[PDB]
Amino acid sequence: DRPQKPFDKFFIDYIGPLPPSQGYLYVLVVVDGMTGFTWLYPTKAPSTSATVKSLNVLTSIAIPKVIHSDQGAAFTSSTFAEWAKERGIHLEFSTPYHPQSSGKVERKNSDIKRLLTKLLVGRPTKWYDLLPVVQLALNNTYSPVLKYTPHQLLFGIDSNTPFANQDTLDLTREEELSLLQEIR
Amino acid sequence: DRPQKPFDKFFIDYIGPLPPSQGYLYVLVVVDGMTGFTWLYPTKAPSTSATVKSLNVLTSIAIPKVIHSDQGAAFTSSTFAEWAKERGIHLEFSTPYHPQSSGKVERKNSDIKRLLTKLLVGRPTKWYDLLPVVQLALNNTYSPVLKYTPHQLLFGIDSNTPFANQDTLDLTREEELSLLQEIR
Amino acid sequence: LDAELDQLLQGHYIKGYPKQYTYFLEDGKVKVSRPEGVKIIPPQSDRQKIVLQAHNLAHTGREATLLKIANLYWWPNMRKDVVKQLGRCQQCLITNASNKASGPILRPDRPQKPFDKFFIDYIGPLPPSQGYLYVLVVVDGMTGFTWLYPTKAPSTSATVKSLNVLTSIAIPKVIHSDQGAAFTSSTFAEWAKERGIHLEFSTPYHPQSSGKVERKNSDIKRLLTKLLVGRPTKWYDLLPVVQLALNNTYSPVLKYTPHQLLFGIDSNTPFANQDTLDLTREEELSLLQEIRTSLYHPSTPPASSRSWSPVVGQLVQERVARPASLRPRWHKPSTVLKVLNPRTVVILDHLGNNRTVSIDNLKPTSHQ
Amino acid sequence: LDAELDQLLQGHYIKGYPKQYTYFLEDGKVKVSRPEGVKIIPPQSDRQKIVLQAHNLAHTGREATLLKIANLYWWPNMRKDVVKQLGRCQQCLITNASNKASGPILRPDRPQKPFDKFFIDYIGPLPPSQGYLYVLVVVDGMTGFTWLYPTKAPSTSATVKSLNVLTSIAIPKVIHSDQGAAFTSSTFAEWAKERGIHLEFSTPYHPQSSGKVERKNSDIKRLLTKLLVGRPTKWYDLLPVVQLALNNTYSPVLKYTPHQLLFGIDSNTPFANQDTLDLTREEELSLLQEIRTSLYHPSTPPASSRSWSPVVGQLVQERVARPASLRPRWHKPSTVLKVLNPRTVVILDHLGNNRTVSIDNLKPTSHQ
DNA sequence: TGCGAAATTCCATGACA
DNA sequence: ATTGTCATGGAATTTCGCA
DNA sequence: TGCGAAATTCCATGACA
DNA sequence: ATTGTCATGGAATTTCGCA
Ligand SMILES: O=C(NCc1ccc(F)cc1)c1nc(N2CCCCS2(=O)=O)c2cccnc2c1O
Ligand SMILES: O=C(NCc1ccc(F)cc1)c1nc(N2CCCCS2(=O)=O)c2cccnc2c1O
Ligand SMILES: [Mg+2]
Ligand SMILES: [Mg+2]
Ligand SMILES: [Mg+2]
Ligand SMILES: [Mg+2]
Ligand SMILES: [N+]
Ligand SMILES: [N+]
Ligand SMILES: [Zn+2]
Ligand SMILES: [Zn+2]
């Protein structure tokens, strides 16, 4: 059996609805299975159309052999199946109510959700502008299991933005108090 | 004493007034002394100004050492003297009432007057357009005294418009009759 | 296709499939263990589609297309099939640049006599001066003697007016011009026929062909610029000065000014040459004739190491004149009917017309 | 002047007036019988005016000026006085062309790593497509990997928007651009400082300096043209296709695609290479590092036989950027302060400023 | 019958929309 | 059915002045 | 240990406003 | 304070298949 590689499998999922930022409401999350590399795309809906528009960007950089998702409507539509067929991409679905990725991906998706929450508090409406720095953070974060960041695994070099502070990622007492205020 | 050359002496004179042609009334006549080459310039007046404008054209092609003329007003003015001085051209005047050129020039000026008269009859108002062909004729006319046309003496080659017909130059009986009509 | 590959699997020899490699079946496909690794040998009936798909990814040339194919496949003489497609891809043929230079320039013979051949051209538009915007430039081929006329337009009418004044002096056998609007009108053709003047045209879009006058345009503009430094660009009143100045300037290679080559004696201008002061005009005209024939004439330079020269029947392509944004820079392939000279040809073109065209506006079609 | 020529007439020897010729008086002027004939030797105090008058007829160079003078005069070392005036004629110095080529081009080292250096540039205006008219092109120096963004203007704002999306992936050490409006604004400088990105600028009016991206612009336009043949020029929807197509095209000299140099493995695109199928990612990244360092690098070509190279303190002249009609193509002479490299210099210029300038936009001032 | 220096010739370079 | 040209200023080469 | 032919490499040419 | 580049397709050169 051949060793696992970048582009072997992209794991995709939506996060949201979120507070409106520059008119956007969701984040399409794409994580490379082998490297843990993350790409994020702001969308206005979790629709097949927004998924195609977003993945059109990514797949103009690299094409995955397999896209893995849950049975979201956007991902099970025949339009999205057409799209993937056109590009020679195999589609892969977790069974309903039972999402399975890999340890690495699960953990990454977790960090993504937590990191978003942490920075959207105080500025719940400014997340659109922060997506770039979010991704750099995620992709320059040291992986305990492998000796390397996703950046390093994807490009085979060190990065010019090492995030040397492995961070709190937890909400400070002040943030817990004003998170219970904004959600009221 | 050095042999005579082109540009040694230009002989100039006005002919007119003539019937208006494209608004013009005179012809400035310039004849190179050595070669008998003729240049003609249509003017609206026998003035210093029209002479300068016309000679400015010619002297942007070749500059004579000496300009010879009679004591026309246009040629004795201090403006014209200034002009000639500016260009290193010596000015030369025949004594009043006693015009002297050379045999060659006299004869040429004669041909010019006669040829003009011949062609202005029938079309006394179309001479402006004919000046080019007049000049070619004059300049490609065989000189009995030298073995050569002015063209040949000026350029040292045969011409592409030889005027093989040495012409009548005399007015036919019909032309004498309609010359006595137009001048009535 | 299926027959060939079949006979191969059972160990028989087929021409062009080297014997020393082992050919097998796997996943329903013929394969072969080659030094680089295992490649799929597709059936011959599949190969055109493969080459085409590889090529079409980015419309790549020989090597870049081959390198894609070689990633998955091997067959005998792959590049032969790649080149086959390249020569058939209309889009590559008309978009790609040439990589073959024109053969070396001709140095036509100097006209034997003054007035044998005029070269004419327009300069402009220039900054408005006295309502004028252009200059008609007339250069006698043999002598280099130049006449300048200011115009308001590069028009047939203004050309005719100017040449009526010029041809007062003499009539030329031939007038050579480029294909400017002014010179190709039927009015101008008539004007010339009326005078027994033969009109000669440059091949289209090839200013080198009017090189004699073009080169004078340079000096004309260069002198005007110098005279106008730190003044407003009132060039009209300087045309005459420039004309006289240039006609009386020495060409260092010839040792004569154009005035001298035309008249064989300087007129009353500064630093007039006096060497023939003691000769008769006739002795002078005789020395002039000798001087005219013995002038330096340059020769055809060496060809560059990868030039091409036209051959009758060759597929060649004409450069598109004013190609629109994102459109091919070349026309469809056309054939060489006649080779007028090594730098000039007649082609049976894109419209089905005979066109006389400079080699500089042609590339040889690639891959035959 | 008068003293020198006096002592000459009475038969004494003066240095530089050869003894074997006879010098006399005639018409109030010193003369000499020289092989070509009798020439006037003017007093030395008159010679500058003579040389100047000769030169000014048509602002001629060494020989063409000399040949006028020689018609009437002779003196010792005439050309020395001619050259003296040439080097002092402001108008000739700023109007004339150079006749010395630039020294041979530098081939800068390929950036060692991906993201070390970006080269960016605009293409356009292109025909309107979905309201877009330009393309921002970003080329990674090391890999050749290219990103394309459609814009409505070559603006700082559109550049910033595009690079915010790009730098989501990674941040580059250096961004090299030309001096387009978009890249030199203080807003763009801030944007870069905010990210610890160093901005590097080409010398002005020298697109070779952005050669890495410029050269990609060619392929970009060439592929777009091919894809658009016989269709309306709806290029917007093809940018992504073109980007992917080019990033996955082999450079025949390197034997790698830019995608390969960036990732060390093909993604799911047609004809993906499979040679590292059995390596671990770590083994693969190790082979990649080896592949990155051993890439062909070209060398500085031979100098042409008449090139010049800048020397500190040299008088040189900068090419006028957009010279108006009939105005000099060169600025006034300026001095070379520092030689950054054989093709790049700092000059103390026409405004009294330090300018960093390409040799290609310079000529060495003639006659010192 | 040979030297140093000046003069002449050679010619690559660039620009004519 | 037509086709490059030639001013320019350093360098290379030749000629000159003298012996 | 050497041949004919294919494969690979060389590289001048031209175009990026 | 900065610097040309590289796809292209014939030709030149090297390698391959076989003996
Ligand atoms: O003067 C010319 N100078 C350029 C030149 C001169 C000499 C040389 F060697 C190189 C270049 C010139 N160029 C013209 N063209 C305009 C650009 C598009 C097609 S073009 O044919 O190139 C042109 C067109 C129509 C009429 N007269 C024209 C003309 O005079
Ligand atoms: O792309 C360029 N291609 C030409 C090119 C490319 C590569 C090569 F080797 C040669 C030529 C280009 N050219 C610009 N210029 C416009 C013309 C007047 C001055 S310029 O500087 O020449 C330019 C100016 C401003 C911003 N970007 C520019 C730019 O991108
Ligand atoms: Mg979901
Ligand atoms: Mg009178
Ligand atoms: Mg023209
Ligand atoms: Mg630019
Ligand atoms: N010829
Ligand atoms: N470098
Ligand atoms: Zn193609
Ligand atoms: Zn000058």
The residues whose Cβ lies within 5 A of ligand 4, an ion, are: B 13, 70, 72
Report the C-alpha gap between B46 and B26 in whole angstroms.
7
Q: Does D40 touch chain C (CB under 8 A)?
A: no
Q: Where in chain D is the domain with CATH 1.10.340.70?
A: 5-97
Report the C-alpha gap between C124 and D127 in whole angstroms.
29
Q: Residue D125: closest CA among chain C residues belongs to which residue?
A: C325
Q: Where are the alpha helices (DSSP H) in chain A?
A: 48-58, 73-76, 78-86, 103-120, 131-139, 150-155, 173-182
Q: Where in chain C is the domain with CATH 6.10.20.110?
A: 250-295
| Phi (first) and psi of residue C308, to 5 degrees | -125, 155
Which overall architecture, per CATH, does domain D98-105+304-365 show?
Answer: Roll (2.30)
DSSP string, B22-67: TTB-EEEEEEETTT--EEEEEESSSSHHHHHHHHHHHTTT---SEE
Chain C residues 29-68 with Cβ under 7 Å of strand H are 35, 59-64
C174-177 and C117-123 beta bridge pairing: parallel
Q: Residue C164: closest CA among chain B residues belongs to which residue?
A: B132
Q: Which amino acid is at D114?
A: P
Report the C-alpha gap between C307 and C315 in whole angstroms.
16
| Superfamily (CATH) of domain D116-249 | Ribonuclease H-like superfamily/Ribonuclease H (3.30.420.10)
Q: Does D64 touch chain C (CB under 8 A)?
A: yes
User: Which residues partner with D23 through β-bridges?
Assistant: D32
Q: Are D118 and D84 in contact (CB under 8 A)?
A: no
Closest chain D C-alpha to C240 CA, distance in angstroms = 12
Report resolution in angstroms: 2.5
Q: Does domain A1-184 have CATH number 3.90.1150.200?
A: no
Cβ of C72: how many Cβ atoms within 10 Å? 17
Q: Does D245 touch chain C (CB under 8 A)?
A: yes
Q: Which amino acid is at B70?
A: D
Question: In this structure, what DSSP letter does residue A162 have?
Answer: -
3-state secondary structure D254-283: CCECHHHHHHCCCCCCCCCCCCCCCCCHHH
Q: Residue A5: closest CA among chain D residues belongs to which residue?
A: D281
Residue C99 to residues B182, C47, C144, C306, Cα–Cα distance (Å): 75, 28, 36, 8
Q: Are D334 and D94 in contact (CB under 8 A)?
A: no
What are the CB-based long-range contacts (under 8 Å, 24+) for A145-149? Answer: A145/A103, A145/A104
Q: What does the buried/exposed string (b/e) look like for C145-177 if buried means 16 or more CB atoms within 10 Å of the residue's CB?
A: bbbbbbbebbbbebbbebbeebbbbbbbbbbbb
Domain covering D5-97, topology: Endonuclease III; domain 1 (1.10.340)
Residue D335 to residues C257, D310, D311, D364, Cα–Cα distance (Å): 37, 10, 10, 10
Task: Cite the annotated binding site of B for Mg(2+) by residue number.
Answer: 8, 70
Report the C-alpha gap between D51 and C64 in whole angstroms.
63
Task: Identify the experimental approach.
Answer: X-ray
User: How is chain A split into domains, by residue range?
Assistant: 1-184
With a CB cutoff of 8 Å and minimum separation 6, the contacts of C30 are C5, C8, C9, C23, C24, C40, C41, C42, C43
Closest chain C C-alpha to D164 CA, distance in angstroms = 28
Q: Where in chain C is the domain with CATH 3.30.420.10?
A: 116-249
| Phi (first) and psi of residue B135, to 5 degrees | -65, -45
Q: Are B15 and B72 in contact (CB under 8 A)?
A: no
Report the C-alpha gap between C121 and A67 in whole angstroms.
67
Domain covering D250-295, topology: Arc Repressor Mutant, subunit A (6.10.20)
3 state SS of D181? helix
* Cβ distance of B155 and C263 shorter than 8 Å: yes
Residue C242 exposed, middle or buried by CB count within 10 Å (0-12, 13-18, 19+): buried
Residue identifier of the C-alpha nearest atom 21 of ligand 1: C205
Tokens (6 digits) for C237: 């009143």
Report the C-alpha gap between C368 and C348 in whole angstroms.
17
Tokens (6 digits) for D192: 């870069």
CA C89 – ligand 9 centroid, Å: 5
Report the C-alpha gap between C213 and C136 in whole angstroms.
10
Cβ of C7: how many Cβ atoms within 10 Å? 13
C117-123 and C101-102 beta bridge pairing: unpaired
Which numbered ligand comes closest to the C-alpha of C343?
Answer: 7
Report the C-alpha gap between A154 and A107 in whole angstroms.
18
Question: Is the CB of residue D247 inside 7 Å of nucleic acid strand H?
Answer: no
Q: C178 a known binding residue? A: yes
Residues of A within 8 A of D141 (CB-CB) are: none
- Virtual torsion, Cα D107, D172, D221, C70, nearest 10 deg: 80
Atom of ligand 1 nearest to the CA of C210: 7
Distance C2 CA to G2 C1' (A): 36
Report the C-alpha gap between A16 and A8 in whole angstroms.
27
Question: Is the CB of residue C16 inside 7 Å of nucleic acid strand H?
Answer: no
Report the C-alpha gap between D59 and D28 in whole angstroms.
30
Among candidate residues B35, B24, B46, B53, the one with its CA nearest the CA of residue B116: B24
Which site among D163, D169, D244, D269 would you substitute to test the A interface, given the most A Cβ atoms closer than 10 Å to its Cβ?
D169
The owner of tokens 């105080």 is: A122
Question: Is the CB of residue D98 inside 7 Å of nucleic acid strand E?
Answer: yes
Report the C-alpha gap between B27 and B13 in whole angstroms.
8
D101-102 and D37-40 beta bridge pairing: unpaired
With a CB cutoff of 8 Å and minimum separation 6, the contacts of A113 are A15
Nearest-CB residue to B89 (from C171, C262, C268): C268
With a CB cutoff of 8 Å and minimum separation 6, the contacts of B157 are B151, C113, C114, C115
Decide: C213 in ligand 1 pocket, CB within 6 A.
Answer: no
Q: Does C167 touch chain D (CB under 8 A)?
A: no
Report the C-alpha gap between B65 and B78 in whole angstroms.
19
Report the C-alpha gap between B179 and B158 in whole angstroms.
36
Tokens (6 digits) for B139: 């300049």
With a CB cutoff of 8 Å and minimum separation 6, the contacts of C267 are B6, B7, B62, B63, B64, C259
Report the C-alpha gap between C176 and C155 in whole angstroms.
16
